[PDB]
Each structure stands twice: as C-alpha cells, then as structure tokens.
Design a protein around this nucleic acid. Sequence first.
DNA 1: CCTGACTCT
DNA 2: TTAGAGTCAGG
Length: 578
Amino acid sequence: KMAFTLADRVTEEMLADKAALVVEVVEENYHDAPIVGIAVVNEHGRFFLRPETALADPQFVAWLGDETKKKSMFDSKRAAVALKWKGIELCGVSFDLLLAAYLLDPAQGVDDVAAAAKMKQYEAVRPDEAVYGKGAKRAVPDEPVLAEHLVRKAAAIWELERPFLDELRRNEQDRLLVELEQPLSSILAEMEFAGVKVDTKRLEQMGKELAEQLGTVEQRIYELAGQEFNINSPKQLGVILFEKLQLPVLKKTKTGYSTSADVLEKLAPYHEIVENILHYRQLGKLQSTYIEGLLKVVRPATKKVHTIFNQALTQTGRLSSTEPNLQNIPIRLEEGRKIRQAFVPSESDWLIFAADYSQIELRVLAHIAEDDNLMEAFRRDLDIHTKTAMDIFQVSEDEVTPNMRRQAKAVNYGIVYGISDYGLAQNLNISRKEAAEFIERYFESFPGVKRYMENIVQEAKQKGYVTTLLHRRRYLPDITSRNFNVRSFAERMAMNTPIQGSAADIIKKAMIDLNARLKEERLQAHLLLQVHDELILEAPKEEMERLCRLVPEVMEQAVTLRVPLKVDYHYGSTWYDA
DNA sequence: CCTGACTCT
DNA sequence: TTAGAGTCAGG
C-alpha cells in the first residue's frame, strides 16, 4: 500500500535538499550498463522517473551533482559509476545502506535492499531477484511494476537510514561508515571508471608463444604417461597417477584422489611426470585466465580493463576484485610475472608507481598483542623471519642457514593463520615432531602473542564477536560449538580476523588520506588499484620524485601503532617494471 | 551448477 | 589438521 507519482517530467519538488535516491542498474557488472529507472523519495512525496527523461534534464543533472543536495542510497558506487558512463557526476551521497548493513554484520551477505530491510524487520519491499528473475529469465518488468519496485526500495532506504545509523552509533561504527567506508566508495568509483590500460599486442604475442609451449609440455606428459588424457581433469589425472603409474595415495577428498600441488610436489621423487604436470597446470592457468580471460574483458576502443572492487563482501573488511580480478595477477614465478608487462600507463610519458606495506599483518600482531620481543624486533627493524629462526632453532643470527629462515617464515605467517603442527610439517615437508617443537618454541619466545591468541578466543566466546582497530566487527556464533572442527575453525577466525581486518582498516584510511593529498597538491597522479597491502598508481614521469616522498609517508602515517609501519615503493614503464 | 585446480595478499 | 579472496575447465 504505497502511493507515488509516475512522472514524465522533472519538477522542482523532486529536487529537495534531502532524498532517498535509486538509480537502477540490473546488470551485475555496472560498467557501461543501462540505467533502467530512477526513484526519488523526499519530504514532498515519492517519484519515479524514466532515465531518458531525467538524465537529459539539466536541472536533474545539476541536482545529481550538487554536493549540498544529500542523497541516501543503497550501493552508491554502482550508481556513481553507471552515471559516470553516462557522462554524469553524482555527488552529495550522505548515507549508503549497503555499507551500513555490511558493517553491522558482514555474515548476512546483504546484497539488496530487501535483505537490509530484513535486519530491521522492514518488509514493504521485495527482493531484486523476485522482481527481475534469474539467469536467462532475467528481465526488466513492465513500467508500472518496475516503478513500484524502485519506489519501494527508495522508501525503504528513506525509513531505514535512522534505524541503521542509530545501531551503528551504538556499536561505535558510525564514524567507520561516514568517515571511512563512504569516502572510500567514491575513491573506488574513480579507480574503477579510470581503469588500467592493457598492451594487447604484447599480451596476444605472449599468448601465441604460451600456446606453443603448453603444446610441448602436453606431449611430454603424454609420452611419460604412456597415454593421452585430459590433464585438466583431476579425475582422469588421478587414474593415471594412482592407478596406472601406481604412485602412493597421500590424500583423498570427497570426490576421489587428491592431485593438489602440495601432494604432487611430494610425489616428485617417484616419477618425473609430476613436475611436468605442475608446470602444465601453471601454464594453462596463465593461458585461460591471464591471457584469454583478460583479453575477453578489455574494452577494445580504449584497451582498458575496468574491475569492480566489492567493498561489502569479505568477512574481514578487505576488498575483493572482480571481472577481472586484478588482485591476483601473477608475480611469484618469472614465467607468470611477465603478464604484468601487459599492464601499462593510460597516457604517453606516464609511469606506473607501486608501494606496499612490509609485513603489515605482523606489525599489527605486534601492536595488538603488545609482545615485547616482536615489538623490539620491529623497532630495530631486525629481519622478522631471522629473529624467529634464532628461537625455534635456538641459534645466533649468524647460524641461521638459508633454509632455517625460510622455515621460520612459514612459521611466522602460519601462526597468524592458526597453523597446526601437522600443517607446518606438511608445509615444510619436515618431521611433525620437529614441526611441533617449532610452534612450541615460537610461543615460548613470543609469550605476548601466545597470550593474545588465548585471550582473543576467550573474548570471542564471551562476546560472540571480535573487532578491529577501527571497530569493524565479525560475529562468530560457532565459537562454542561442541563439534571440534567447527569450533576450531571459529577459534582461528577469532585469532586472525582482528589482524587481517585491522590491516584492511589501515590501508583504506591511507587511500583516503592519499587522495586528499593528491587533489590538494593538484598532482595528475591517481590510484589505479589496491591489492590488500599495496597501492598502484599512474602519473606523468615528472611526478615520480614527488610520489616517492608522498605515497610512502601517507601510507606510513595513516595510523600510529606501537611499532613503525614500513612501506617500499618502485616505479617503471609497466606494472612489471614497478 | 559444484569441485578442485592455480592465482594473489 | 593454515586466514581472506576470484576464475577457470571439467564433470
């Protein structure tokens, strides 16, 4: 039961200084996607507008871009970017119901207004899926039906703003929404719309050479196997390895024999076909994903790729990156790393600039756990992987063999992922008795870190959630489960979430601080990408000297911890060279 | 459509 | 029996 005006022209009363606004984009990937309808709810009434009408009306465009005209929305970044593709600027967004719901409880997986409304028992709006349908049936409904839906979403947003802000304020998360997530949303919109330029001539040539190489390795595998088979079928592969070649079975999953990389690496001493298969699967992923999959999403006229940074998805406060994912481009092996030669500046005589925090999660552990030894080591900037090696091996720094340090590495992060003796033994391919001693020795050497792990788990049990430095929360209702596996997993989330989530908080603030300094100083440099603990920029070559000063400082000063934050940086002609 | 593989932080 | 993610081919 809800009255509204199905308008055929914009009127002055639609342009009030406070409104709920819906700019509807049905396609999941909102880059260059149709806007199918608009709804406005304000003190004067409820209005639906056809986009052809509204977006061509100079007063409505003026209103959209007037920062003093405040809009309440759901997923304002989607709207903002879709409008950028329509050549229209959206300003004055004061409340984003998507981000408010996300901060209240990321586990709800809220991704439409109806799901947010459910959190406050508000039911006068339908789910998007119920209106548009799914898969090949997905379609925009008849105008009267669309209009009612959009108007109901706007009225829900209108009514839900205060209840959500009130609950955020109670949680000490109001400033997290208003001063961190909402400002970041605008910075992400800019980054997404800018996109990253791709050197398609180079990428296509890499793909042509890769196809030939894959072919060679493929035939070698068939030769070694005595038979052709589909290497990319774990099922067929399992028959070859474990039935035909009779290699030991080290692990099974629900569907059959495991052929995971960890497993195959341990089989290398039995047959040379296993190293070839590992190489083949690496090369094939390069081909399928970073050559072919990437070329599929390049906008041909501009040679740019435009990712979407999902800001309201991860359980810890990280971003994710989709279609394409530009946060998992290869780097570890030179063979894959060369993909980065295809990512280039968007203008002649510009360069790529990349800065990353060094061991931010470990410096966060040090802060939160107030562990003296760990804090001391970072204060002197003693190498952290060598410090741990000296303790779990019980030797002086000058006795830390190359492999001892690398063994201490995986212990160092492994502790922050809740690693068991079994897992550490499987990782380093070492004695499980020794793996247990390594862990034992670590926690006796970093008693503060040990105290934290015990304390944070007890807190999770008492409160039902854990929190980050800037008051992000994660609820862990399974932490008291009687089931060992369920409970143990939740305890590891209790240990890790405050650390990963705090590191996310810090880089988000650094992004907001950096943008502000860039704009103030009128630098042409701008952000392209965030990769969890790294920021990627492009800028004219003349600005490198400045950025070498500005970017590391901003990132290092974003928060003040009990240990220093450290940032490394490099630049060059392609992402590879940075 | 899910599973298991490779990719990153 | 190691935290958080996305995309892919195969089944």
